[PDB]
Structure 1
Amino acid sequence: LQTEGSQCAKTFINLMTHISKEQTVQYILTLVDDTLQENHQRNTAWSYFLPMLNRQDLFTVHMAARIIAKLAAWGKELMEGSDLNYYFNWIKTQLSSQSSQYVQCVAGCLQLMLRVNEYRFAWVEADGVNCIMGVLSNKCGFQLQYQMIFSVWLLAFSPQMCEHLRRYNIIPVLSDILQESVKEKVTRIILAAFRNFLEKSVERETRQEYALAMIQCKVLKQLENLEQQKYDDEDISEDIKFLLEKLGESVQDLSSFDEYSSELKSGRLEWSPVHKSEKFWRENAARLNEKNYELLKILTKLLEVSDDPQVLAVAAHDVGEYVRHYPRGKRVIEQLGGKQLVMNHMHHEDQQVRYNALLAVQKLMVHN
């Protein structure tokens, strides 16, 4: 009972390797995992026990993975990151999702290595992060998804790693996990993963993580009813109010018309929350006339010359919302002949540009 375990470790390490009784060696490895779980030093010998492990038995592969995670994530001089880039490649086959009964356990061993900061930089470079994307694709992620979102939540702390992880479709794949919300602990870490993403960016490329991520997805509309629910854990109730205030400004800060001017002058006229928001059109009432009513005339020009199976419905929506907020603009589009263009474009074969132009042509003639 506490027996100043310090000596006889070299006799135990020699006994852990040389013994052909795998039943006793699994019991020897389980006693080492139980004892060293709450105590200190037991890393050249750590590299030595790795080659005798990871072979031909289901018990010793993850029990060594338990003790090699405890050895690598604990200790100052025991930090041996050169052995870490060595270690990841051997168990990467086991880290694949082709195994049964152990995909949950090695994910737990993966979280211990992903805890400390310098271990994370060498991880994601050697990773090929698609291993997380493989299990994030539907493969019965009841507990498995909670382990992997906890892994990427660890990857959000260091600032330069945030622009490393953004070369993917991460957050709308993650918001697809958020809309399920069955486990009630996957949503507490995937909202924390949204916070640790958004808070720790020193750049203006947080707006890269709204357009891909937040405003253009079914997450911000979901966060309104996330506030309405009755959660108990106090960090969640401050996680939603932090995300609601960060995304509350994020809808109108591009809802400026500048961006819209960046959209209109450069073209391509995409589907954006600046078009559906009425506080946009509450502001830019006279701003088309501030641009000498060319800013409307450049919009009907791209409406004229191009067929545009998607953005013509956006262009038909843009002339509709301006006309409701300025009655003299009805006379403006009559001088340009854009009404007869909407008359032609409402008879189009596509239903989205038909429905938008029908609302556009009926906004022109509310009162005559």
Structure 2
Amino acid sequence: MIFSIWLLAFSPQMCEHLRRYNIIPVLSDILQESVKEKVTRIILAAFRNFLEKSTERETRQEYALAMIQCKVLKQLENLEQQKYDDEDISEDIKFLLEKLGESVQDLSSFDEYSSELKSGRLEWSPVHKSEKFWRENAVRLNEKNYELLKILTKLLEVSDDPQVLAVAAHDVGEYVRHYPRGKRVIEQLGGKQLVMNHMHHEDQQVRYNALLAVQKLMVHN
């Protein structure tokens, strides 16, 4: 069956049309769960065909994002340490790891981060867990008179969605973690109280990230 999917994945026209069928989720589950090298190779070849052959950089980004969300990069890194009788497997792994690496670099843009905050799309987009982004860019949230922090705190005030809440708390935590001067800014926005409320939220995902955020806010003077 996946050899048949791989034939469809070869043609740019079909790569654009077939998106509706949710292929990467299904094939990523098979790639993670199934052990056999045959299945592994033909999925990696299908994934390579999607990211090579797609008609749009946006369609490539849609596929690569879906792959990253479906933990494919973590699986590819394990598959790089696994070894095979056919080096086309390893070349497809390297190709995918590079194209997903570019997708992570695109996703790590502060403009994409800003756009997702402005759009309220706080849904574990891989940007939130990009250590490179936070380590090298957390100071940027001070832009336009602290506009992104005002959004994060406003989302912690306004939102019902536990994902939006847990993620906004996570972002406050990483902001402090990589920009310690920001603690005073979050206090000036009152945001310490929001995470101190949300550490008692009905969802453990919110509680956990809110606990981390308040703990970083409270870690030192």
TM-score range, shorter chain: over 0.9
- Structure 1 residue 311: Cα displacement: 1.3
- Taking the aligned partners of 1:332 and 1:244, their CA distance within structure 2 comes to 38
Paired residues of 1:223 and 1:244 also in contact (CA < 8 A): yes
Relative to structure 1, the CA distance from residue 174 to residue 207 in structure 2 (aligned partners, 3 Å threshold; closer, same or farther) is same
- Structure 1 residue 305: Cα displacement: 1.8
Relative to structure 1, the CA distance from residue 211 to residue 267 in structure 2 (aligned partners, 3 Å threshold; closer, same or farther) is farther
Give SS of 1:210's match: helix
Paired residues of 1:210 and 1:250 also in contact (CA < 8 A): no
Give SS of 2:20's match: coil
Q: Can you list the C-alpha shifts for 1:283-305, whole angstroms capped at 9, x where unaligned? A: 32321222211221122012112
Q: Can you list the C-alpha shifts for 1:145-190, whole angstroms capped at 9, x where unaligned? A: xxx1111111122211111111121111011111233332111111
Paired residues of 2:15 and 2:55 also in contact (CA < 8 A): no
- Structure 1 residue 212: Cα displacement: 5.7
Relative to structure 1, the CA distance from residue 276 to residue 242 in structure 2 (aligned partners, 3 Å threshold; closer, same or farther) is same
Q: Can you list the C-alpha shifts for 1:116-158, whole angstroms capped at 9, x where unaligned? A: xxxxxxxxxxxxxxxxxxxxxxxxxxxxxxxx11111111222
- Structure 1 residue 208: Cα displacement: 4.7
Relative to structure 1, the CA distance from residue 207 to residue 156 in structure 2 (aligned partners, 3 Å threshold; closer, same or farther) is closer
Q: Can you list the C-alpha shifts for 1:193-230, whole angstroms capped at 9, x where unaligned? A: 11111101231233453366311012210111101112
Paired residues of 2:176 and 2:217 also in contact (CA < 8 A): yes
- Taking the aligned partners of 2:133 and 2:146, their CA distance within structure 1 comes to 18
- Taking the aligned partners of 2:66 and 2:169, their CA distance within structure 1 comes to 26
Paired residues of 1:169 and 1:212 also in contact (CA < 8 A): no
Q: Can you list the C-alpha shifts for 1:37-75, whole angstroms capped at 9, x where unaligned? A: xxxxxxxxxxxxxxxxxxxxxxxxxxxxxxxxxxxxxxx
Higher mean alpha-carbon deviation, 161-170 vs 209-218, is at: 209-218
Matched, 1:151 2:8: no
Paired residues of 2:41 and 2:89 also in contact (CA < 8 A): yes
Paired residues of 2:107 and 2:126 also in contact (CA < 8 A): no
Relative to structure 1, the CA distance from residue 225 to residue 349 in structure 2 (aligned partners, 3 Å threshold; closer, same or farther) is same
Match of 2:144 in 1: 291
Paired residues of 2:51 and 2:64 also in contact (CA < 8 A): no
- Taking the aligned partners of 2:8 and 2:164, their CA distance within structure 1 comes to 37
- Structure 1 residue 234: Cα displacement: 2.2
Unaligned runs of at least 5 residues, structure 2? none
Unaligned runs of at least 5 residues, structure 1? 1-147
Paired residues of 1:316 and 1:342 also in contact (CA < 8 A): yes
Paired residues of 1:152 and 1:193 also in contact (CA < 8 A): yes
Give SS of 1:167's match: helix
Greater relative contact order (CA < 8 Å, ≥ 6 in sequence):
2
- Structure 1 residue 319: Cα displacement: 0.6
- Taking the aligned partners of 2:64 and 2:159, their CA distance within structure 1 comes to 26
Q: Between Structure 1 and Structure 2, which shows a larger proportion of helix residues?
A: 2
What TM-score do you get using the length of structure 2 for normalisation? 0.94
Instruction: Report how many residues are paired.
Output: 221
Root-mean-square deviation over aligned CA pairs: 1.5
- Taking the aligned partners of 1:149 and 1:211, their CA distance within structure 2 comes to 18
Larger radius of gyration: 1
Q: Can you list the C-alpha shifts for 1:84-123, whole angstroms capped at 9, x where unaligned? A: xxxxxxxxxxxxxxxxxxxxxxxxxxxxxxxxxxxxxxxx
Q: Can you list the C-alpha shifts for 1:304-334, whole angstroms capped at 9, x where unaligned? A: 1222222100000011111122222111111
Relative to structure 1, the CA distance from residue 301 to residue 211 in structure 2 (aligned partners, 3 Å threshold; closer, same or farther) is farther
Relative to structure 1, the CA distance from residue 168 to residue 212 in structure 2 (aligned partners, 3 Å threshold; closer, same or farther) is farther
Match of 1:328 in 2: 181
- Taking the aligned partners of 2:204 and 2:134, their CA distance within structure 1 comes to 25
- Taking the aligned partners of 2:35 and 2:146, their CA distance within structure 1 comes to 52
Higher mean alpha-carbon deviation, 278-287 vs 221-230, is at: 278-287
> 1:188-337, aligned counterparts within 5 Å?
188-210=41-63, 213-337=66-190
Q: Can you list the C-alpha shifts for 1:224-255, whole angstroms capped at 9, x where unaligned? A: 11011120112112111111111122112111
Q: Can you list the C-alpha shifts for 1:234-285, whole angstroms capped at 9, x where unaligned? A: 2112111111111122112111111111101111311111111111112323
Relative to structure 1, the CA distance from residue 268 to residue 196 in structure 2 (aligned partners, 3 Å threshold; closer, same or farther) is closer
